[PDB]
Amino acid sequence: CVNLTTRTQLPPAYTNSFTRGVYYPDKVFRSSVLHSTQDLFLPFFSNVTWFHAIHVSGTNGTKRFDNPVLPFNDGVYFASTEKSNIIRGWIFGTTLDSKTQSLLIVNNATNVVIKVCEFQFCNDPRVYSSANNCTFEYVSQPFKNLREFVFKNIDGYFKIYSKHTPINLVRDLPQGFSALEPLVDLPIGINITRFQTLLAAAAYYVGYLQPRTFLLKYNENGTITDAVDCALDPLSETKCTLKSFPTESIVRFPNITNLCPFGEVFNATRFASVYAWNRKRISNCVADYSVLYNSASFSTFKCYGVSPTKLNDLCFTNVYADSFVIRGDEVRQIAPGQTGKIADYNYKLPDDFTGCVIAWNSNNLDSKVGGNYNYLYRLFRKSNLKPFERDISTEIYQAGSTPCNGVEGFNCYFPLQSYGFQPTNGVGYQPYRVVVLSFELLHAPATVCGPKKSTNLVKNKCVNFNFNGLTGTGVLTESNKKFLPFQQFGR
Amino acid sequence: QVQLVQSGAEVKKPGASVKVSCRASGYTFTGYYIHWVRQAPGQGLEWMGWSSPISGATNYTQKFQGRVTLTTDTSINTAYMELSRLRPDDTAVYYCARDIAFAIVTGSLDPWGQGTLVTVSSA
Amino acid sequence: VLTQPPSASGSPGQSVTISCTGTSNDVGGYNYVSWYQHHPGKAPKLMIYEVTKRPSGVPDRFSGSKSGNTASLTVSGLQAEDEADYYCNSYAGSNNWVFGGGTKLTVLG
Ligand SMILES: *[C@@H]1O[C@H](CO[C@@H]2O[C@@H](C)[C@@H](O)[C@@H](O)[C@@H]2O)[C@@H](O[C@@H]2O[C@H](CO)[C@@H](O)[C@H](O)[C@H]2NC(C)=O)[C@H](O)[C@H]1NC(C)=O
Ligand SMILES: *[C@@H]1O[C@H](CO[C@@H]2O[C@@H](C)[C@@H](O)[C@@H](O)[C@@H]2O)[C@@H](O[C@@H]2O[C@H](CO)[C@@H](O)[C@H](O)[C@H]2NC(C)=O)[C@H](O)[C@H]1NC(C)=O
Ligand SMILES: *[C@@H]1O[C@H](CO[C@@H]2O[C@@H](C)[C@@H](O)[C@@H](O)[C@@H]2O)[C@@H](O[C@@H]2O[C@H](CO)[C@@H](O)[C@H](O)[C@H]2NC(C)=O)[C@H](O)[C@H]1NC(C)=O
Ligand SMILES: *[C@@H]1O[C@H](CO)[C@@H](O[C@@H]2O[C@H](CO)[C@@H](O)[C@H](O)[C@H]2NC(C)=O)[C@H](O)[C@H]1NC(C)=O
Ligand SMILES: *[C@@H]1O[C@H](CO)[C@@H](O[C@@H]2O[C@H](CO)[C@@H](O)[C@H](O)[C@H]2NC(C)=O)[C@H](O)[C@H]1NC(C)=O
Ligand SMILES: *[C@@H]1O[C@H](CO)[C@@H](O[C@@H]2O[C@H](CO)[C@@H](O)[C@H](O)[C@H]2NC(C)=O)[C@H](O)[C@H]1NC(C)=O
């Protein structure tokens, strides 16, 4: 938390941003067209601000540092002109200190890192002071010359567009035109209303986005060559108004890339004791459940409100896994509201629970002729448990009038006991492992989904089709059109 | 079945320490407190102290507070008791007794072991 | 501590009473009195535990009760195999317990 403030505070520095800032609204290929759109753009011939944080001051001195947080109204346009890698990344959040999950974007000379976590930023970002449980991560390639970025956040989605154009004429924004191609479409779902830059004389221009109605000119290959802004002059307003200057099926879906790590919980060796059950959170994966039921190694695969051979086409937001080891004839106690003490002193289920239950046999794995003695379960407590509560406190349970002051004696007892496992027993005392799956979803983009299919494209027989959701009917054939290498379909 | 086996005899000298072991076969070891008892030759029985095999908490009698220790090795099913710095008049016999409760101190001592004979003299 | 009569006699067939006199907060405080039978050399064996409750193996001929600050045993029926002495135990207090002196049982057989 170094203190390097300088306190100069010279606000007024403004420059004209003109014919600058037009991106590709959506992923389509159109050729020789004049399209019209109503969306968030930067007004032509506007005032952008010229921050000059680090500066060589007058003789005998070079010190100023005034890069503050700025309002994030609807989106932002950020332009930089640096001869080196001096600026590095950004921080986004509401209050930036353990109240809303903040977002960090940084990068090396060779790698880039995006992370959403509940930070506690210090003053004048060695950048933060602590980190905790958090949600998302990502790695890819890192992002004179001029570099321009456009940041938008809508509907639980963060979108970043970028462009690199080399100039050497002057420090001001050049006259001319260049569109900005799409780069990143992260799902996060947090809310943002302030931001702050970080760098390691520095100058950058910042401007704000507003809703307008643009007219765009697509040329022969599909690159926005020119644009005109309505509502600027009567002339351009007239420019706007005049608009001038079956046999079978086919299903085809992408590869199956990101398998989901169920090979850990169902294969590990040191699961738990009954009162210290773990909790594993799984997200951002493609999970196939068909491999599980057919495994034939399970002897209890009950379910609640899922209908197993129906779920494979559903997407949730969070999936949790719990795991532990209990004695034999208590697998009939992990269910909706019940009581056999292991449902109301160690583990408790909600009434409207939607999940699945697993139970192996483990006779030949945890056996010990002497006795395993390593698994503990609770026996004494004054009050029952609300759903999903852990208690690892070994306090001495009073059972009499006199306070014993933490002395295990005549009326103060120990609240734990050990399972005596051994191989000469039978079913009903042998150890059964248990894994419980729970599903949840709320107001957030889905991440966990089932695996989709593909059906051996046929082109010369005029049939149905479903290309990644663009259903239709017709005859298919190969073309010579070259898209841009991000566009999907062309209308 | 439920059995306790105690170690062999022992002869020591004044100013020395002695340690005896009691081994449990049958039941599940954790879950029953264990008491020790001493019988003098010709006198009456007396109480020694109790220990627990699950936590480790232990307690003695009022007069035997200084020179007595006692532990439990919950891996090979055994419990040890050591009395140090024996006067020659402490010739007696020591018994290990198991309680019959379940994680409670109750006091019905059954079953008992066999009994060690300890002899301390200046010879 | 506490004590009881150190002598007792008996004859086959009939019944005798053997006592154990309690103190203020030795026997009359809490209900944990138990009595044992001690052959000459072997280990003891439970004859009665916690008030008058009895394990399986000991016949019903044994009994007991607690008259405030006094415990007792009565054997209505004698098979001459019971000649050794007997001991009475109770929760003395503060996780420390006390036994009794013992009472030799004499038969005329
Ligand atoms: C989708 O998969 C096909 C083929 O399936 C597998 O893809 C590999 C990643 C690997 O898992 C192999 O088992 C299979 O090949 C991919 O088609 C391949 O494309 C490359 C590109 O030139 C070609 O050399 C291979 O021969 C193709 N595979 C076959 C079997 O001919 C395809 O690329 C995958 N999708 C994407 C977007 O890459
Ligand atoms: C959990 O493990 C079983 C056991 O299979 C082996 O596990 C490891 C010890 C290692 O040796 C693996 O290579 C073995 O496969 C898994 O069961 C296997 O599943 C695969 C997948 O279909 C199948 O081809 C094997 O025949 C199975 N082997 C046995 C013995 O059942 C199981 O799949 C693992 N859990 C998960 C979630 O995959
Ligand atoms: C052995 O146990 C005694 C506890 O005696 C009683 O136990 C309970 C019923 C409770 O009511 C206690 O308060 C009773 O005293 C332990 O003696 C106590 O120890 C701690 C710390 O010294 C404290 O509670 C009291 O001061 C003690 N009470 C006394 C001395 O009367 C004693 O410590 C235990 N032995 C060991 C080695 O821990
Ligand atoms: C906004 O851009 C215009 C340049 O087009 C400038 O606005 C001038 O603002 C000052 C004081 O705010 C006025 O005295 C001038 O008359 C304005 N001129 C014009 C042409 O608008 C200025 O450079 C930018 N900043 C502000 C605050 O207006
Ligand atoms: C680059 O940034 C990453 C993450 O911010 C730093 O951590 C490295 O991450 C890469 C990712 O593949 C790993 O391969 C490296 O092993 C990580 N480094 C260490 C030390 O664990 C990384 O240090 C940064 N610098 C470089 C040169 O990669
Ligand atoms: C549209 O794309 C086509 C193909 O990518 C371009 O045609 C090539 O253009 C380059 C540079 O002008 C020439 O060297 C090639 O010989 C052209 N190829 C053919 C087959 O003619 C075309 O120039 C692009 N349109 C514009 C306006 O740049």
The domain that contains C39 carries what CATH number?
Answer: 2.60.40.10
Q: Which domain holds residue A211?
A: 14-245
- How far apart CA A335 and CA A350 sit, in angstroms, is 9
Measuring CA to CA, which residue among A19, C43, A163 is closest to residue B98?
C43
- Mutation probe of ligand 6 site: the residue of A29, A32, A220, A484 with most atoms within 8 A of C-beta: A220
Q: How many residues does chain A have?
A: 491
Give exposure, B50-81, as e/b (b: 16+ Cβ within 10 Å): bbbbbeeebbbbeebeeebebebebeebbbeb
Which two three-digit tokens encode residue B107? 């006091």
Q: In chain B, what residues touch A420 (CB-CB under 8 Å)?
A: 28-30
For residues A420 and A164, is the Cβ–Cβ distance under 8 A?
no
Measuring CA to CA, which residue among A24, A182, A34, A28 is closest to residue A491?
A28
Q: Which is the closest atom of ligand 5 to the Cα of A139?
A: 11
- On whether residue C55 sits in a domain, the answer given is yes
Our answer on whether the CB atom of A220 is closer than 6 Å to any ligand 6 atom is yes
Amino acid at A417: Q
Query: What pairing do the DSSP bridges indicate for beta strands A432-440 and A355-359?
Result: antiparallel
Going from the Cα of A265 to the center of ligand 2, the distance in angstroms, rounded, reads 13
- State the chains in contact with C (3 or more Cβ–Cβ pairs under 8 Å): A, B
Q: Which domain holds residue C30?
A: 9-107
Phi, psi of B93 (to 5 degrees): -125, 140
- How far apart CA A387 and CA A349 sit, in angstroms, is 5
Amino acid at A92: F
Measuring CA to CA, which residue among A94, A100, A68, A110 is closest to residue A198?
A68
3-state secondary structure of A236: helix
Which two three-digit tokens encode residue A360? 């192996």
Q: Is the peptide bond before B111 cis (omega within 30 degrees of 0)?
A: yes
Q: Which is the closest atom of ligand 3 to the Cα of A404?
A: 10
Shortest-distance ligand to the CA of residue A106? 5
Sign of CA dihedral A235, A236, A240, A242: positive
Amino acid at A152: K
* Domains of chain B and any CATH numbers: 3-116 (2.60.40.10)
- On whether residue C4 sits in a domain, the answer given is no
Of B55, B59, B77, the CB nearest to A414: B55
Shortest-distance ligand to the CA of residue A141? 5
Which among A273, A372, A373, A395 is the top mutation candidate for probing chain B, defined by the most B β-carbons within 10 Å of its own β-carbon? Answer: A373
- On whether residue C64 sits in a domain, the answer given is yes
| 8-state DSSP, A163 | E
Residue A416 CA from chain centroid, whole number: 41
Residue A173 CA from chain centroid, whole number: 35
> Which protein residue's CA is at the shortest distance from atom 18 of ligand 3?
A407
Sign of CA dihedral C57, C61, C66, C70: negative
- How far apart CA C48 and CA C29 sit, in angstroms, is 19
Our answer on whether the CB atom of A111 is closer than 6 Å to any ligand 5 atom is yes
> Which protein residue's CA is at the shortest distance from atom 20 of ligand 3?
A407
- Number of domains chain C is built from: 1
Beta-strand (E) ranges in A291-363? Answer: 318-326, 355-359
- How far apart CA A424 and CA A442 sit, in angstroms, is 49
Is C96 in Cβ contact with B47 (below 8 Å)? yes
- Whether C91 has its CB under 8 Å from any CB of chain A: the answer is yes
- On whether residue C2 sits in a domain, the answer given is no
- The CATH number assigned to the domain holding A97 equals 2.60.120.960
Residue ranges of B 50-69 with Cβ closer than 8 A to chain A:
52, 54-55, 57, 59
Contact partners, residue B1, CB within 8 Å, separation at least 6: B26
Q: How far is CA B67 from CA A371, B46, B64, C47, C51, in A?
A: 33, 17, 7, 33, 35
Contact partners, residue A362, CB within 8 Å, separation at least 6: A325, A430, A431, A432, A433
Reported resolution, Å: 3.8
Our answer on whether the CB atom of A409 is closer than 6 Å to any ligand 3 atom is yes
Q: How many residues does chain C have?
A: 109
Residue ranges of B 82-111 with Cβ closer than 8 A to chain A:
103-105
Is B109 in Cβ contact with C32 (below 8 Å)? no
Residue A214 CA from chain centroid, whole number: 32
- Whether C91 has its CB under 8 Å from any CB of chain B: the answer is yes
Q: How far is CA A307 from CA A19, A311, B69, in A?
A: 57, 7, 61
Of A370, A409, A410, the CB nearest to B77: A370
- On whether residue C26 sits in a domain, the answer given is yes
| 8-state DSSP, A237 | H
Q: In chain C, what residues touch B114 (CB-CB under 8 Å)?
A: 43
3-state secondary structure of A235: helix
- How far apart CA A353 and CA C49 sit, in angstroms, is 49
- On whether residue C67 sits in a domain, the answer given is yes
- On whether residue C56 sits in a domain, the answer given is yes
For residues A132 and A63, is the Cβ–Cβ distance under 8 A?
no
Is B106 in Cβ contact with C50 (below 8 Å)? yes
Beta-strand (E) ranges in A42-145? Answer: 46-51, 70-71, 76-80, 87-93, 102-107, 112-117, 134-140
Listed as own residue / partner, the contacts of A408-413 with beta carbons closer than 8 Å and 24 or more positions apart are: A408/B52, A408/B55, A408/B57, A409/B59, A409/B105, A409/C95, A410/B105, A410/C91, A410/C95, A413/A380, A413/B103, A413/B104
Is B29 in Cβ contact with A414 (below 8 Å)? no
Place of tokens 């008030």: C51
- How far apart CA B111 and CA C43 sit, in angstroms, is 9
- On whether residue C58 sits in a domain, the answer given is yes
Shortest-distance ligand to the CA of residue A259? 2
For residues A194 and A71, is the Cβ–Cβ distance under 8 A?
yes
- ∠ CA C25-C31-C34, rounded to 5°: 105
In terms of CA atoms, which chain A residue is nearest residue B104? Answer: A413
Amino acid at B34: I
Is A370 in Cβ contact with B30 (below 8 Å)? no
3-state secondary structure of A78: strand
Measuring CA to CA, which residue among B117, B93, B85 is closest to residue B13?
B85
In terms of CA atoms, which chain B residue is nearest residue A396? Answer: B55
Q: In chain B, what residues touch C100 (CB-CB under 8 Å)?
A: 44
Is A371 in Cβ contact with B59 (below 8 Å)? no
Contact partners, residue B93, CB within 8 Å, separation at least 6: B38, B39, B41, B115, B116, B117, B118
Which residues sit opposite A463 in a β-bridge?
A474
Which two three-digit tokens encode residue B77? 């099913």
- Whether C35 has its CB under 8 Å from any CB of chain B: the answer is no
